[PDB]
Amino acid sequence: IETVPVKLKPGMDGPKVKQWPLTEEKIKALVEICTEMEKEGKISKIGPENPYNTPVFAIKKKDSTKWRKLVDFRELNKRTQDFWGIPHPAGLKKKKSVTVLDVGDAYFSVPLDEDFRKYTAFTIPSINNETPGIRYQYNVLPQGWKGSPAIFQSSMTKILEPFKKQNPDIVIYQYMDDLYVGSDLEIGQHRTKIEELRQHLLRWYELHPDKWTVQPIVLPEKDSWTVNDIQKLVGKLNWASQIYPGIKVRQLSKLLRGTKALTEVIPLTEEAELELAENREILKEPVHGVYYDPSKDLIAEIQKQGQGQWTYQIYQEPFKNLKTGKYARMRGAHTNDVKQLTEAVQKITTESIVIWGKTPKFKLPIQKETWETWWTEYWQATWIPEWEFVNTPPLVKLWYQ
Amino acid sequence: MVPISPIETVPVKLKPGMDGPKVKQWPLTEEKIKALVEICTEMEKEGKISKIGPENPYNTPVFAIWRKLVDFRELNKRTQDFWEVQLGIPHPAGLKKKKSVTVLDVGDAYFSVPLDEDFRKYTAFTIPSINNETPGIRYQYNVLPQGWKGSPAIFQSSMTKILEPFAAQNPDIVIYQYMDDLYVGSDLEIGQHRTKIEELRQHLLRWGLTTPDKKHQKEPPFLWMGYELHPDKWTVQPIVLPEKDSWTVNDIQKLVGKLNWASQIYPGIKVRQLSKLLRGTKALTEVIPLTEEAELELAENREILKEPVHGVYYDPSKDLIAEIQKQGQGQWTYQIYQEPFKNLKTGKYARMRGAHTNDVKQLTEAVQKITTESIVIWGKTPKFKLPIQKETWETWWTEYWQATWIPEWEFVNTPPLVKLWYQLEKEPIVGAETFYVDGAANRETKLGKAGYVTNKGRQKVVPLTNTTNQKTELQAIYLALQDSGLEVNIVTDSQYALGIIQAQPDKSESELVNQIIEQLIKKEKVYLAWVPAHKGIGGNEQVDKLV
Ligand SMILES: N#Cc1ccc2ccc(Oc3ccccc3OCCn3ccc(=O)[nH]c3=O)cc2c1
Incomplete structure (x- = not known):
């Protein structure tokens, strides 16, 4: 209920990033959603005096037909000041099971610092540039921003305090709009405890x-x-x-x-x-x-092994792997390489979040234009990692196979 | 006097750390001065400008060509960035046919929109008096100046804000807004159309905006x-x-x-x-x-x-179709249409700059381009007609090391067809001769050797002038291809050659690579294996080509 002052890094103007084209259905979905949000005060229309823009598009999460609004806050995040630090729960990866929850709806209760609001400006685009796009800015804490969980840390602590005092054996971690909950219970007891925790977050x-x-x-x-x-x-x-x-x-x-x-x-x-x-x-x-090394980037390399099989390595220094794995999971992706790759990237990113508490920089075995054309069609995650494109076939392909 | 509605101003600031423009006024002829005096007098009478006192430090140069011309370049350099909506332009193929289309131009365009009063003092300019024996006449703008950085964006946003309720109250008509022109359209009868045009220009007139009273000056x-x-x-x-x-x-x-x-x-x-x-x-x-x-x-x-x-x-009720043809030399052409022989639009794609390439990749890229363009223009991906067999695409994407995808498409048979010219074996070939190849070159003399030895005792070493390691390593493989049967196994230590060939080009800028490709095309089965050099691996002879 009380706004905390937020500024940018020294010598950095607010983000100006081209909004990429959207299909008609995603546009309509975003129009409906943003109309509702405007009616709820979460966003407000802006004028031409705001130069800043951040990309935005629509998705569909697992087991839901309802469209969702996803904002690519990457540039704003790297341009936003560093927020302070909670040491990563090294026991989270050691736990038997971990369940991920979406705590994004909570952020919209807390108002955003006024002076900063002009930096969260985004545009719902129009087909064929017929009419000027619908420009909005955020009034509350936006999902996808790195400042939103940092600000809500105190509140989240206050909410999860009784549950933490109840089960000391349950590890609780938070990354962006997601809450990771680790334990050693049984799947049934796990699900019931998850319903308990989500109901505990519901009444609050x-x-x-x-x-x-x-x-x-x-x-x-x-x-x-x-x-x-x-x-x-x-x-x-x-x-x-x-x-x-x-x-x-x-x-x-x-x-x-x-x-x-x-x-x-x-x-x-x-x-x-x-x-x-x-x-x-x-x-x-x-x-x-x-x-x-927390001061060094995490790098992930992915190789296509064929027949729905994929190998990957997470490291920092070459030939010094921190993690290796092989994603071969098949759901509905049988005829599509890009969908497989996208889901693989998501899974690896999630694992990376669980282990180190940050996302890796990807090196994708795909042409830039193909990936950039199709990756938003299969993305169910609320965050986004960084990526580059390797155009030369690696010889080590079968050496991980 | 009917109280026309006001227009809320757009707050404008200068770039941070900067101050308003101060520039020396240019010397003008007496004629020019008189003309500017009359013009600015008329404008002041209209309310577009206003006289200011000596207090204002800021000044902008003005000229006469009579018509006045205020050079706001410096102020534009000092004015804040704005959000421009003119990025990209509507493509005519994206428009939906209407039975009636009328044009209303907004005469009295920028001068009908008020400027933020706090910013008006930065648009100040002076008129040189006759013989400069009196202080120049000082003016400032009260509306959006022509040539200013912020005029078009503010004008567009204002006009949009005005038009929004009328548009909401008339879903049965479509209004497009471009610069100083408004384009209205409807599938209604002509009378009802003209009527709603009158309603619209009335609604605009409520904010004090003027449209052509006569028969509209422009027609199809x-x-x-x-x-x-x-x-x-x-x-x-x-x-x-x-x-x-x-x-x-x-x-x-x-x-x-x-x-x-x-x-x-x-x-x-x-x-x-x-x-x-x-x-x-x-x-x-x-x-x-x-x-x-x-x-x-x-x-x-x-x-x-x-x-x-x-x-x-x-027409949204009909499917969207894009058909592609190969033209050769990396050139591709395409047509987007709904009914046959009636194109919505056409286009072309040229291959990127690279050392090696093949037709399938270029086709993929072309498809990506058309897909993006189509999402921009019509907000959907068209169904494709491609000159490539389903089986060819299947084999390609299943065996390709990179991830690749094409949206929904069908095979149209219109030569030339895109095809896979050769395919490497996944396993060594039984009964096929085994050529151990190698090449080496001297970095100084640019002299080298390339050749092979085989399991059947076949050998060859060829001396080469003006060549490099990579070239000799390619030349060895080429030699093995030349002197071998329709089925052949090839062992090399060249990561370079193996990379090139595993990229699967059907064409190249290097003649040697092209010749190797032509060799691969003639072959029935080819297995290309790789081993580390200088590991003392038997049959692989660095000692034969280093002499
Ligand atoms: N931004 C922008 C912009 C710039 C110029 C335009 C010219 C005509 C026009 O026209 C249209 C205006 C409103 C709605 C539908 C339109 O066009 C559908 C196709 N069409 C065309 C011309 C004609 O005579 N009859 C037609 O059926 C819309 C325009 C929009």
Whole structure:
């Protein structure tokens, strides 16, 4: 009920960002939604004296036919002053199960600092630029802004105080418009506790971190090796030598001596088997000296493995993975690569939020124009990460497969 | 006197850390001075301006050409940024046909809109007196000045704010607002239409706005922004192509621009050969000769622009269809229509700048472009007709390392068809010869060697002058392709070559790569394997090409 003063970073003007085109249905949805919000005082129409603009579009969350308004507050977020800090709950990732809740509706109760409101300006676009877009600005705390959870921290603490005093074994974390709740209960008891907590938030997505871990580098086990098998093996070991110190391939390379046919079977020497065994033993151990630096960006690389399968690696320094994984989940995405990639990016981002409390910078295996054309059609998340585009095929593709 | 409604001003501030403009007034002839005096007298009588005292430090230069001209460039440099709604323009193909369309121009346009009084003191300007033996006559604006930065945006927003209730009260008619013109339309009868036009200009008159009293000064066809707008159809204004035996760079730019403009409705417009001459620009004076390709292309452009073609308007009750054709040399053309033979609009796509490429990728890019354009113009994605088989697209996107997608589309058979020219094996080939290739080059002498050894004892090493490591590594693979059967396995240590080939080009800027491609096309089965160099891997011989 009392506005807290908010400014920008020194030497930075408010965001001016081109609004990209929308389909007619998304436009109509946004018109309806924003009309209602205007009737509720959450937003207000502005004049030409406001140069600032932030992109906006519409989505549909899981198990809901109701359109939702999503604002790409990325530029405003990086232009907004740093807000202060709560140390990340390192036990959240260690918990058996975690449920994510949408606490966005809460923000609209708290009013936004007047002087700052002109920076949250957005435009509902029109088809074919027929009539000028509908320009609004926010009066209350907007969803997607990084200042909104920072301001509501005290309120959220006050609301969740009894529940925290009730169950000390339940971990509670907050990121943007989402509230992550971790525990070790049973799925039924979990869901009932979630109904309890959501009812506790009312009067005022099952995710299991334990079923996800890091992944090792495995080598084939064969009774018979062809020249091709040994060549690929040597390639993989040579690559993995960039990560593990003691990997040697000279005894295996010794088998390839001479020029033979790729399909010809070569029996392994004892030295070769020994070398391979040692390499296995080495790969079984974790990676030497791998730490997390909060001052460094998180980078995520994604490879398309085909047949709905995808591999990914989260790291900071090259060959120093903090997390690795393989998304192969198929829901309704069978005929569409882009949908799969988008859902994969969302899942990886979510995992990243659970582990470190921030999103990674993605390196997507897709052409810029394709991604930029289609990614908003399959995006159900309230936040957005940063991304770049790799136009050169990586050779390491099958080395994670 | 009927009390016309006022208009709320738009608050305007100068850019932060800046102060209002102060500029020395230019010396003027006595004639000019008298003219400016009479004009500014009339304007002051109208209320557009007002005399001010000596207190105001700010001043703007004024000229006479009689018509007065206030140079607000400095104030524009010092005035705040505004939200401009003119980014992009409505495309005629996006308009929906109406039985009646009337035009009301807003004479007394900017001068009917009040300016924020706190800002008026920054628009101050002076008139030099005769012989300068008296203090100059000081004036300030009370309305939106012509040439000011904030005039168009404020005017547009004001007019919108005024028009909103009438539009809400008349959903059965559509009103478009562009600069100093209003375009009204309706599917009603002509009498009811003219009636509602009278109602509208009355509603506007309530705020003290004037529209043409006589029969409206403009009637179809409408000449607007290079377009001709007829009742049943739209097209572009007639083309102008200069013909001279000596061409400059600027002339090339103008020609390219006009051809690109004409290409949105005239199908088959090609602009590559003339755009290739725009390398090494920034020099507007030069003489650039024509190739036979460029001359034949321009002749074909004069062939297409020979007879007029018209686009139609948009009917939402019918599907939206976009058909694509390959033209060659990275050129693509497309038509967007609803009924066959009746285009809504046309267009072209040129491949981007790259070392290697294939037809499927370019097709994908073209589709993306048309998709974006279509969402801009009609707010939906059209159904596509593509010259590519379903099976081809299937194989491509299933085996492509990148993620890729095309919206709903069907196969139209209109050659040339986009096809996959070759496909690499996923596994080594049984009974196929195994060529271990390698190439090396000396960084100093630019001398190198490329060759292969095989499992059957076949060997070759070829010496090369003026070459690099990458070139010799490609040359080795090419050699293996030349001297092998319809089925072949190839082992290389070149990450470069493997990258290039795994990118799957059907065409390249490098002749050697093109020759390798032509080799791949002739083959039945090709397996390309990779191994690390200098690992002592048997059969892979750096020692053979390093001599
Ligand atoms: N911004 C902007 C802008 C600029 C110029 C315009 C010219 C005519 C026009 O016209 C229209 C105005 C209101 C509603 C529907 C319109 O056009 C549908 C197609 N059409 C056209 C011309 C004609 O004679 N008959 C027709 O059926 C709308 C315009 C809008």
